């Protein structure tokens, strides 16, 4: 009833000119955050999903591109969706994006999944604009509620025991999936450890094994690390986001790793396209590309 | 911050009575957070690459069961360890008394006269509820001839990493 | 896994020790075998020769399935298989008449193997972190079970035969999708640790009171709407946590009968009033957490008999005032009243001699009442996001104060008595209207963190600030600092500290 009304009010702006905000009352957003937090705590931190599934990269508050992605892939519950994080910051409509994602998660808990990104942190939100947008449009209480909801987000997902999905990438401390299973929630993102590397690491072709990361945190890993991880864990593909790619997707370690970026025209300064990977029952991955303006 | 290759592996086992704070200390050491809720632990293993005394090492901290109901394979998990942390709560006299039993169990499973271990006094922030004084803890440590350290898992953490680093140093010395 | 790209198809193109250990075990005639953490994918069939084994440890491996030769190990008493890729177990395990403990945590079992239901000799069973969706009625055969943990599964209901396991002591069904608990659970009178947290339970059976030996009951994060009165018979409970439920009222005799109740948690519930009953219901609890509720009034004299209560949490409630006996809470140590509609603090607060941590953030306070300095043992004071205009001079008597937060307040000047806070280490003055800082601020030797960002009227810093040798972190963001050279301001906090020290008289 109320959830359907919220979803309808969020989707009624589809097809209009970008920049039109959706005015939802504070109580509805707070209820969405609370119910989404309950559902997140009701599910394992390491998701085990099954095909068919749609996998999307960073959004960063570009709501109208989220709507384009839904139009291309089909609005729920037509197709299952898996998001790799970074839904807020660096966008003019972060609130609308996060509200729509939480509403879809609440309405379809078993067909809609959201992973935690590096921006889903209080420290990052306080700096990169989400706190500013929340303060401008609402009170700081809503921002704290959003932080509480984000602290319970799952970290990694596995699709058909062959595809490993995470925001950042591999970690030197990651030797078994039970280590991810033992991460407690709710939790803030630390500056070091397994969670920090899982949310911040990036691949690099110039690194043989592990190397320093230009972001000032976590580590970079090469193709050999990816191959060894896949061989040890009997996986086939690593699906990641975190990094901007011109074509919306880019293969690494001879197609053993794929980086997905879903927001075209990132921050208004890049000419990159947004891509979404579709996985069928036969694990025949295919990419749908949103052409830039 | 990049670990080197062929790092030595140290297997650390945390033992003690139920509710003393072994899991909280381990989570604070690894995840850098404090878990306010209590959940009995059967067995949990954690791995971390860290540099101690300018030497990189792999720490494999193993968390055991403090409750007799959940302590089914505790001896087997202790048998595979290289160092032990005997953790007791300063607010619980029974946990401090069971330190002797845990030390005897470690000696029996290892079949050695002495073994690298450290006595850990947890929950020292709860000064109003503290029942075991520092003098009693040092006396217990001096009798068993083992290092003594007081830790607090609640934020802000107190010597949480120091206990594990000291245990690694003791393992290296012997 | 394959990729349909570029109008074509692309693909992601990339046990001697075990045998020696088995031979060594056979030669030594050892009764224990440890093959854990060896990356074993297929267990060699030669293990059948080790008929003398009583303990087998195969955990932390990559075993897809166990060979049928394991059934020849009739003398096995312990079988550890945790952290593997097992999807089923061979039927040859029926021969293991002496098996007492089975460990199957962190596996890929879609259901409990049928052979497990025939291992009636089992006393401990672990099935955590599996894909099990149902429990068959054959569980009744495992009457000798004393420890059963099936948490972190997709089980939606439990069979009525669960009540025939009279030997159960601990039952763990947490983190499942259970919606109802069968009334037969009361027949397991020996249960002392029952875990029901993170489920979808709507109500508890009235037979739960038959668990006279129950000491731990996990009910947090469920859909419970009421607590049956039979729970009062479980007087051995030490903690009652009811976080994140729909409970709005409690039985009158529930908390009174819980003589051993040391802590009570009612957070994130639908409570609009305190539980009905006398002060005796809180006489035994050490801590009382009732945050995130809709409580608007604290009953008068509710904590008169609560001599042991030390921690009270009322964060995010509908409180608009405080009871007249607020000063009688002499046993209080930590008090949290954040996120409420409080407009003033009564003068009776001076009677809280034992108070150490006081949180009053996110309220409508405009001035701190006189007599706040009587809190000798006060250590942490939080006043973030309030409407404070000025601070009383009695704040100088807080000798034990270590952390003070005044972010997002209408304060204009600080009292000259702030320099007497020798134990103060943290001072948050951001988003205030501070025109200047008092010269006494330099006497705070133990001050380590000072926050002054977003102050629009802070045009100058006192030269005594350089005397704080322990000052390590300072925020001066967005400050005008029109009375200082722009180069030093743009240099950073260290440059400002150096300039203050060099020019210090
Ligand atoms: N205040 C405070 N509480 C603590 C501290 N360390 C542990 N606790 C509390 O101790 C209780 C039990 O913590 P656990 O980590 O589960 O203890 P444990 O001994 O590992 O538990 P078992 O595995 O059941 O034996 C929880 O309520 C913790 O929050 C501490 O330093 N300070
Ligand atoms: Cl980023
Ligand atoms: Mg534990
Ligand atoms: Mn990112
Ligand atoms: Mn990003």
Q: Give the span between the Cα atoms of B88 and B133, in whole angstroms.
A: 12
**Torsion, CA C494, CA C496, CA C497, CA C503, rounded to 10:** 140
- For C45-48, the CB contacts below 8 A with 24+ separation are C45/C69, C46/C19, C46/C22, C47/C22, C47/C73, C48/C72, C48/C73
Q: Give the span between the Cα atoms of A44 and C417, in whole angstroms.
A: 53
CA-based end-to-end distance of chain C: 74
Q: How far is A112 from chain B (nearest CA, A)?
A: 27
Q: How far is B162 from chain C (nearest CA, A)?
A: 22
Q: At what angle are helices A63-73 and A94-107 packed, to 10 degrees? A: 40
**Torsion, CA C65, CA C71, CA C73, CA C79, rounded to 10:** 40
Per the CB < 8 Å rule, is A210 touching B3?
A: yes
Q: Is C172 helix (H, G, I), strand (E, B) or coil?
A: strand
The strand pair at B9-16 and C334-336 is best described as: unpaired
Look at chain A and report how many structural domains it folds into: 1
Looking at chain C from residue 305 to 364, which residues have their Cβ under 8 Å from any Cβ of chain A? 339, 362
The CA R_g of chain C, rounded to the nearest whole Å, is: 32
Per the CB < 8 Å rule, is C82 touching B69?
A: no
Rounded distance from Cα A279 to ligand 4 centre (Å): 22
Is the Cβ–Cβ distance between A111 and A76 less than 8 Å?
yes
Q: Tell me whether residue B116 is annotated as binding.
A: no
Report helix, strand and coil shares of chain C as percent, to nearest 5: 25, 15, 65
CB-based contacts of C122, cutoff 8 Å, min separation 6: C99, C100, C101, C102, C116, C142, C144, C145
Eight-class DSSP state of A131: H
Q: Tell me whether residue B40 is annotated as binding.
A: yes
Is the Cβ–Cβ distance between C323 and C298 less than 8 Å?
yes
Is the Cβ–Cβ distance between B57 and A214 less than 8 Å?
no
Nearest beta carbon to residue B35 from set A175, A184, A194: A184
Q: Give the span between the Cα atoms of C105 and C86, in whole angstroms.
A: 10
Test mutation, B11, B27, B41, B47, chain A, max A CBs within 10 A:
B47
Instruction: Tally Cβ neighbours within 10 Å of residue C279.
Output: 13
Instruction: Tally Cβ neighbours within 10 Å of residue A216.
Output: 8
Is the Cβ–Cβ distance between A140 and A189 less than 8 Å?
no
Q: Which helix (H) or strand (E) holds A69?
A: helix A63-73
Parent domain of A275: 1-290
CA-based end-to-end distance of chain A: 37
C431 φ/ψ sector (left φ>0, alpha ψ -120 to 50, else beta): left
Fold of B9-173: Rossmann fold (3.40.50)
Q: Give the span between the Cα atoms of A210 and A229, in whole angstroms.
A: 13
Looking at chain C from residue 358 to 387, which residues have their Cβ under 8 Å from any Cβ of chain B? none
Is the Cβ–Cβ distance between C134 and C158 less than 8 Å?
no
Per the CB < 8 Å rule, is C10 touching A162?
A: no
Neighbours of ion ligand 5 (CB under 5 A): A 58, 86
Rounded distance from Cα A199 to ligand 4 centre (Å): 7
Is the Cβ–Cβ distance between C84 and C61 less than 8 Å?
yes
Is the Cβ–Cβ distance between A86 and A56 less than 8 Å?
no
Name the neighbours of A, counting chains with at least 3 Cβ pairs within 8 A. Answer: B, C
Strands, DSSP E only, in C47-113? Answer: 55-57, 78-80, 101-103
Rounded distance from Cα C381 to ligand 2 centre (Å): 36
Q: How far is C8 from chain A (nearest CA, A)?
A: 11
Q: Give the span between the Cα atoms of B71 and B66, in whole angstroms.
A: 7
**Torsion, CA B38, CA C81, CA C119, CA C30, rounded to 10:** -120
Closest by CA position to A236, among listed C85, C42, C11: C11
Q: What angle do CA C334, C340, C342 make, to 5 degrees?
A: 90
Burial class of residue B111 (count of CB atoms within 10 Å of its CB; 0-12, 13-18, 19+): exposed
Q: Give the span between the Cα atoms of A134 and A99, in whole angstroms.
A: 12
Q: Give the span between the Cα atoms of A195 and A180, in whole angstroms.
A: 8
The values of phi and psi at residue B10, to 5°, are -110, 125
Rounded distance from Cα A201 to ligand 4 centre (Å): 9
CB-based contacts of C456, cutoff 8 Å, min separation 6: C433, C478, C480
Q: Is C139 helix (H, G, I), strand (E, B) or coil?
A: helix
Eight-class DSSP state of C298: P
Closest by CA position to A69, among listed A292, A276, A280, A285: A276
Q: Give the span between the Cα atoms of C4 and A287, in whole angstroms.
A: 8
Alpha helices in B10-155 (DSSP H): 22-30, 74-79, 93-97, 99-110, 134-144
Q: Give the span between the Cα atoms of A78 and C70, in whole angstroms.
A: 47
User: In sequence order, what DSSP letters do the residues of C449-491 get, joined into one string?
Assistant: EEE-TT-SS-----GGGGG-TT--EEE-TT---TTS-HHHHHH
Contacts of B42 in chain C (CB under 8 A): 105, 126, 128, 149
Q: Give the span between the Cα atoms of C222 and C236, in whole angstroms.
A: 22
Q: Give the span between the Cα atoms of C355 and C330, in whole angstroms.
A: 8
Q: Tell me whether residue B154 is annotated as binding.
A: yes
Closest by CA position to B57, among listed C281, A134, A173, C67: A173
CATH code, A55: 3.60.21.10
Is the Cβ–Cβ distance between C468 and C447 less than 8 Å?
yes
């Amino acid at each position: 009833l109320n959830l359907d009304s919220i979803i309808g009010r969020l989707l009624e702006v589809q097809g209009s000119r970008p920049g039109k905000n959706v005015q939802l009352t504070e109580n509805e957003i707070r209820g969405l955050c609370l119910k989404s937090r309950e559902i997140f705590l009701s599910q394992p931190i390491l998701l085990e999903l099954e095909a068919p599934l749609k996998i999307c990269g960073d959004i960063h508050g570009q709501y109208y591109d989220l709507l384009r992605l839904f139009e291309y892939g089909g609005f729920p519950p037509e197709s299952n969706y898996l998001f790799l994080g970074d839904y807020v910051d660096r966008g003019k409509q972060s609130l609308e994006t996060i509200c729509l994602l939480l509403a879809y998660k609440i309405k379809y808990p078993e067909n809609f999944f959201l992973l935690r990104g590096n921006h889903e942190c209080a420290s990052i939100n306080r700096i990169y604009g989400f706190y500013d947008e929340c303060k401008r449009r609402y009170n700081i209480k809503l921002w704290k509620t959003f932080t509480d909801c984000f602290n319970c987000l799952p970290i990694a997902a596995i699709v058909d025991e062959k595809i490993f999905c995470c925001h950042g990438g591999l970690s030197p401390d990651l030797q078994s999936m039970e280590q991810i299973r033992r991460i407690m929630r709710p939790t803030d993102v630390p500056d070091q450890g397994l969670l920090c590397d899982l949310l911040w690491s990036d691949p690099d072709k110039d690194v043989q094994g592990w190397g320093e990361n230009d972001r000032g945190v976590s580590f970079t890993f090469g193709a050999e690390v990816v191959a060894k991880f896949l061989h040890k864990h009997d996986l086939d593909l690593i699906c990641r986001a975190h990094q901007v790619v011109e074509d919306g997707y880019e293969f690494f370690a001879k197609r053993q790793l794929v980086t997905l970026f879903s927001a075209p025209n990132y921050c208004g300064e890049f000419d990159n396209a947004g891509a979404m990977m579709s996985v069928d029952e036969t694990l025949m991955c295919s990419f749908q590309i949103l052409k830039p303006a | 911050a990049v670990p080197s290759d062929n790092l030595p592996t140290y297997k650390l086992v945390v033992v003690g009575d139920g509710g003393v704070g072994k899991s909280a200390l381990t989570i604070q050491f690894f995840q850098k957070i404090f878990v306010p809720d209590y959940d009995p632990t059967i067995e949990d293993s954690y791995l971390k690459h860290t540099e101690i005394d300018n030497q990189w090492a792999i720490l494999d901290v193993l968390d055991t069961a403090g409750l007799e109901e959940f302590s089914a394979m505790r001896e087997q998990y202790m048998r595979t360890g290289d160092g032990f942390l005997i953790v007791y709560s300063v607010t619980d006299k029974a946990s401090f008394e069971h330190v002797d039993r845990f030390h005897q169990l470690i000696l029996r499973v290892k079949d050695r006269e002495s073994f690298p271990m450290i006595l850990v006094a947890n929950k020292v922030d709860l000064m109003h509820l503290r029942k075991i004084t520092r003098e009693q803890g040092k006396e217990m440590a001096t009798k068993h001839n083992i290092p003594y350290i007081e830790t607090s898992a609640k934020d802000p953490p107190l010597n949480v990493d120091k206990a594990f680093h000291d245990l690694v140093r003791v393992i290296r010395q012997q | 896994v394959a990729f349909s790209v570029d109008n074509t198809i692309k693909r992601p193109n990339p046990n001697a020790e075990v045998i020696k250990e088995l031979n060594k075990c056979r030669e030594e005639n050892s009764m224990r075998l440890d093959l854990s953490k060896r990356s074993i994918h297929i267990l060699p069939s030669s293990i059948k020769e080790l008929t003398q084994l009583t303990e087998l440890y195969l955990y932390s491996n990559k075993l897809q399935s166990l060979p049928a030769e394991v059934g020849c190990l009739v003398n096995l008493m312990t079988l550890a298989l945790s952290e593997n890729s097992l999807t089923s177990l061979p039927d040859s395990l029926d021969n293991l008449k002496k098996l007492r403990m089975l460990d199957l945590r962190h596996n890929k079992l879609r259901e409990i193997p049928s052979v497990v239901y025939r291992l009636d000799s089992l006393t401990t069973l672990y099935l955590r972190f599996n894909r099990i969706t149902t429990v068959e009625k054959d569980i009744k055969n495992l009457s000798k079970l004393s420890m059963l943990s099936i948490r972190e599964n997709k089980i939606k209901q439990l069979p009525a035969e669960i009540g025939e396991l009279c030997n159960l002591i601990t039952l763990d069904v947490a983190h499942n999708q259970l919606e109802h608990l069968p009334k037969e659970i009361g027949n397991c009178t020996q249960i002392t640790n029952l875990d029901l947290q993170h489920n979808e339970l709507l109500d508890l059976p009235d037979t739960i009171g038959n668990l006279s030996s129950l000491s731990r009951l996990g009910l947090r994060y469920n859909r419970l709407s009421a607590i049956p009165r039979s729970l009062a018979k479980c007087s051995a409970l030490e903690e009652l946590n009811l976080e994140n439920n729909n409970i709005s009222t409690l039985p009158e005799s529930l908390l009174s009968s819980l003589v051993k109740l040391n802590s009570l948690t009612l957070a994130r519930n639908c409570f609009q009033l305190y539980p009905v009953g006398g002060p005796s219901q809180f006489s035994t609890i050490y801590s009382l957490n009732m945050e995130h509720n809709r409580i608007n009034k604290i009953p008068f004299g509710i904590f008169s008999r609560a001599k042991v209560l030390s921690k009270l949490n009322m964060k995010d409630n509908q409180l608009t005032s405080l009871p007249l006996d607020f000063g009688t809470w002499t046993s209080m140590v930590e008090l949290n009243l954040a996120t409420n509609q409080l407009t003033k603090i009564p003068e009776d607060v001076s009677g809280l001699v034992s108070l150490e941590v006081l949180i009053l953030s996110n309220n409508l306070l405009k001035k701190l009442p006189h007599g706040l300095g009587n809190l000798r043992k006060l250590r942490e004071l939080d006043l973030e996001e309030n409407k404070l205009e000025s601070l009383p001079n009695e704040i100088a008597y807080l000798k034990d104060l270590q952390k003070l937060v005044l972010t997002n307040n209408q304060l204009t000047t600080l009292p000259r008595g702030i320099g007497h806070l020798t134990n103060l280490t943290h001072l948050g003055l951001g988003e205030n209207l501070l025109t200047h800082l008092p010269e006494e601020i330099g006497t705070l030797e133990n001050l380590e963190e000072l926050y002054l960002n977003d102050n629009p009227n802070l045009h100058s810093l006192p030269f005594e600030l350089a005397l704080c040798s322990k000052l390590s972190i300072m925020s001066i963001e967005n400050c005008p600092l029109s009375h200082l050279p722009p180069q030093i301001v743009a240099g950073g906090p260290s440059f400002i500290i150096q300039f203050l020290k060099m020019q210090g008289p």
